[PDB]
Amino acid sequence: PTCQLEGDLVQSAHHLLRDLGADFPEHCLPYNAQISFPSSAFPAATANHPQCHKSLWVVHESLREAGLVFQDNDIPVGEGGVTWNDQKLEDFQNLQYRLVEEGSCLSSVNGSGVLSSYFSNVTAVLQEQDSAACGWMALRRDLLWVLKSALQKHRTCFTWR
Ligand SMILES: *[C@@H]1O[C@H](CO)[C@@H](O)[C@H](O)[C@H]1NC(C)=O
């Protein structure tokens, strides 16, 4: 295994996740107290220090932990649920799985608890029926940002073509 995250998969995962839903709704704003992605998890790249290992770790670990969230929690669909494109969701999850498997070496090093703490807060919101839809929408918002930011600020860390 060459342990690399393929940029084309990351870009396509971002596009599918973008296209399957809508903007984060105003009524979900209070959940930002609980679901606040630690943007400081990404390193500040400098000349000769792209910090690709840490940047790829943030992407891989966020996708791995989100995979567990999808496995362990039902998405509500009715009123009080989310209105997502289920076919594009399945396609996103297939790309997510490919990225998590190919980057397994990035999870072989224990990281700071900063990401696990974020996902523990997401889980708590998802596992109460009255807050679940907002939790799903906040998670999607943050995963979109993780993928967008990695491509915008850490493009060189992915393998292309
Ligand atoms: C989790 O939510 C609590 C509030 O319920 C907040 O104080 C804490 O900072 C959150 N954890 C993270 C990692 O953001």
Side-chain angles (χ1 to χ4, degrees), residues 6-21 59 63 88 91-93 95-96 99 140-152 160:
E6 289 179 87
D8 305 283
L9 282 178
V10 174
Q11 195 159 66
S12 288
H14 173 267
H15 292 353
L16 285 160
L17 189 61
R18 177 190 65 195
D19 280 1
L20 67 78
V59 175
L63 288 172
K88 293 193 177 219
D91 283 339
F92 168 83
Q93 292 181 110
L95 279 57
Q96 170 189 25
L99 284 161
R140 167 168 175 274
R141 170 205 64 204
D142 291 338
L143 288 173
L144 280 168
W145 178 80
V146 167
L147 299 175
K148 183 168 163 213
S149 195
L151 294 165
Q152 170 192 54
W160 293 97

Side-chain angles (χ1 to χ4, degrees), residues 33-34 36 114 117-118 121:
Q34 290 78 24
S36 193
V114 202
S117 287
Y118 168 84
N121 269 17

Side-chain angles (χ1 to χ4, degrees), residues 31-38 113-122 124-125:
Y31 295 101
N32 291 166
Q34 290 78 24
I35 303 174
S36 193
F37 190 87
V114 202
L115 264 183
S116 62
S117 287
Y118 168 84
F119 282 98
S120 155
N121 269 17
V122 169
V125 177

Side-chain angles (χ1 to χ4, degrees), residues 1-2 8 12 40 51 75 79 81 85 106 120 122 131 134-135 159:
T2 189
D8 305 283
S12 288
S40 99
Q51 284 206 258
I75 307 161
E79 288 133 316
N85 183 315
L106 297 163
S120 155
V122 169
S131 51
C134 280
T159 309

Side-chain angles (χ1 to χ4, degrees), residues 29-64:
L29 284 172
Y31 295 101
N32 291 166
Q34 290 78 24
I35 303 174
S36 193
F37 190 87
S39 79
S40 99
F42 278 114
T46 50
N48 257 15
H49 287 76
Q51 284 206 258
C52 281
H53 192 265
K54 176 70 172 333
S55 298
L56 293 172
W57 173 84
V58 177
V59 175
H60 182 263
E61 185 71 0
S62 295
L63 288 172
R64 188 190 74 78

